[PDB]
Design an enzyme around this catalytic site. Structure first.
Site, PDB file in Angstrom:
ATOM      1  N   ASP A  36       0.866  -1.151   0.000  1.00  0.00           N
ATOM      2  CA  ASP A  36       0.000   0.000   0.000  1.00  0.00           C
ATOM      3  C   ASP A  36       0.911   1.212   0.000  1.00  0.00           C
ATOM      4  OD1 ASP A  36       0.855   0.540   2.581  1.00  0.00           O
ATOM      5  OD2 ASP A  36      -1.164   0.864   3.399  1.00  0.00           O
TER       6      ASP A  36
ATOM      7  N   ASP B  53       1.172   5.064   2.048  1.00  0.00           N
ATOM      8  CA  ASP B  53       0.728   5.805   3.203  1.00  0.00           C
ATOM      9  C   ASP B  53       1.169   7.266   3.073  1.00  0.00           C
ATOM     10  OD1 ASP B  53      -0.073   3.340   4.638  1.00  0.00           O
ATOM     11  OD2 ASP B  53       2.092   2.820   4.301  1.00  0.00           O
TER      12      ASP B  53
ATOM     13  N   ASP C 222      -3.530   4.770   2.271  1.00  0.00           N
ATOM     14  CA  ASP C 222      -3.959   5.296   3.550  1.00  0.00           C
ATOM     15  C   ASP C 222      -3.636   6.785   3.617  1.00  0.00           C
ATOM     16  OD1 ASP C 222      -4.870   2.843   4.367  1.00  0.00           O
ATOM     17  OD2 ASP C 222      -2.886   2.315   5.288  1.00  0.00           O
TER      18      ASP C 222
HETATM   19 MG   LIG Z   1      -0.986   1.453   5.008  1.00  0.00          MG
HETATM   20 MG   LIG Z   2       2.329   0.792   3.967  1.00  0.00          MG
END
Ligand SMILES: [Mg+2]
Ligand SMILES: [Mg+2]
Ligand SMILES: [Cl-]
Ligand code: NA
Length: 328
Positions: free
Chosen positions: A194, A196, A252
């Site tokens: 992912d 962030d 995120d």
């Molecule tokens: Mg994350």
């Molecule tokens: Mg991450």
DNA sequence: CGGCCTACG
DNA sequence: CGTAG
DNA sequence: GCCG
């Protein structure tokens, strides 16, 4: 020689004991799937000790005195040194329980408890879950539909393109607000699961109410495949361009006031083990309570102002570690 | 033996 | 319950 | 599972 907490020693992203650490981390993961957080922590800590060593372990002798190596973790290493495999680790790897719990917990919206309940109900595959969508939350449905894309790693090249689109939306939502890359990419990873981002504004208080404004703008741009929607953390699935098409990526987004930014940057940069160890060190060795908002002295009932991550390390009496050395 | 990070959605 | 690092 |  080797300090007991991971926040007391540098841990680089790549190291000299990769095979040994990976095997201990299988056992840590399997302990988590059984709800044994203490065993998970020990095997994670033992693995991280090996990551912090300056050269390969070649002989069992070299584990003497290392923190977090007792009878069990030492036997794992001994078997790998002598035979190239550890029978316990390989039994875990092949087990139906481990493989299914790993597959189910990989789904966004599914944790150990849900995965374990599905396992006990007899479910084993993603197609098992798809045939019973009555048992699924909206979040889990999104995680299942996007599971294939979300299983493929994000590249640092992808990250920079994404950051510019987030910055565009953030600048319209609140001129002067900034976007900082956190998580594993800030620790030097070339790939990740992912991306962030941490958002703030230099004028204390201006960031109030910001995240809904950012999310509305990204949704209006057609970039949001999934999100949960006052709020300050958003766990999203974004559309990332690819040659002739696109792919889903987990992103995120986190907002913090600038007074809290060093604490949020420290927390969201990780690693997960590093942060747990740092909070444990803070409380148990220094009597101070750390989170992603601040550092509290419970006897004077005061919060430590920090203007940088460097300040936080100093206030905890720890040598500063740059993000690249926080790969515990 | 107790303890094992500490939050938000 | 999920999410985060 | 290991530390203190
Ligand atoms: Mg994350
Ligand atoms: Mg991450
Ligand atoms: Cl345990
Ligand atoms: Na999950």
């Amino acid at each position: 020689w080797m300090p007991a907490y991971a926040c007391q020693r540098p841990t680089p992203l790549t190291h000299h004991n990769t095979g040994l650490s990976e095997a201990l981390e299988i056992l840590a993961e399997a302990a988590g799937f059984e709800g044994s957080e203490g065993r998970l922590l020990t095997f994670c800590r033992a693995a991280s000790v090996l990551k912090a060593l300056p050269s390969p372990v070649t002989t069992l002798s070299q584990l003497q005195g290392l923190p977090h190596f007792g009878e069990h973790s030492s036997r794992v290493v001994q078997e790998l040194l002598e035979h190239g495999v550890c029978e316990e680790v390989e039994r875990v790897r092949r087990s139906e329980r481990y493989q299914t719990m790993k597959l189910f917990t990989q789904i966004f919206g599914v944790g150990v408890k849900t995965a374990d309940r599905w396992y006990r109900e007899g479910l084993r595959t993603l197609d098992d879950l798809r045939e019973q969508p009555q048992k699924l939350t909206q979040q889990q449905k999104a995680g299942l539909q996007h599971h294939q894309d979300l299983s493929t790693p994000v590249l640092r090249s992808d990250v920079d393109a994404l950051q510019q689109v987030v910055e565009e939306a953030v600048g319209q939502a609140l001129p002067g607000a900034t976007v900082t890359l956190t998580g594993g990419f800030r620790r030097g990873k070339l790939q990740g699961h992912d991306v962030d981002f941490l958002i703030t504004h230099p004028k204390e208080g201006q960031e109030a109410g910001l995240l809904p404004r950012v999310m509305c703008r990204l949704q209006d741009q057609g970039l949001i495949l999934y999100h949960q929607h006052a709020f300050e953390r958003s766990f999203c699935i974004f559309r990332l361009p690819q040659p002739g098409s696109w792919k889903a990526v987990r992103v995120d987004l986190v907002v913090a006031p600038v007074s809290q930014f060093p604490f949020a940057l420290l927390g969201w940069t990780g690693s997960k083990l590093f942060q747990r160890e740092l909070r444990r060190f803070s409380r148990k060795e220094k009597g101070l309570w750390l989170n992603s908002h601040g550092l509290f002295d419970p006897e004077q009932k005061t919060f430590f102002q920090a203007a940088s991550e460097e300040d936080i390390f100093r206030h905890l009496g720890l040598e500063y570690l740059p993000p690249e050395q926080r790969n515990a």
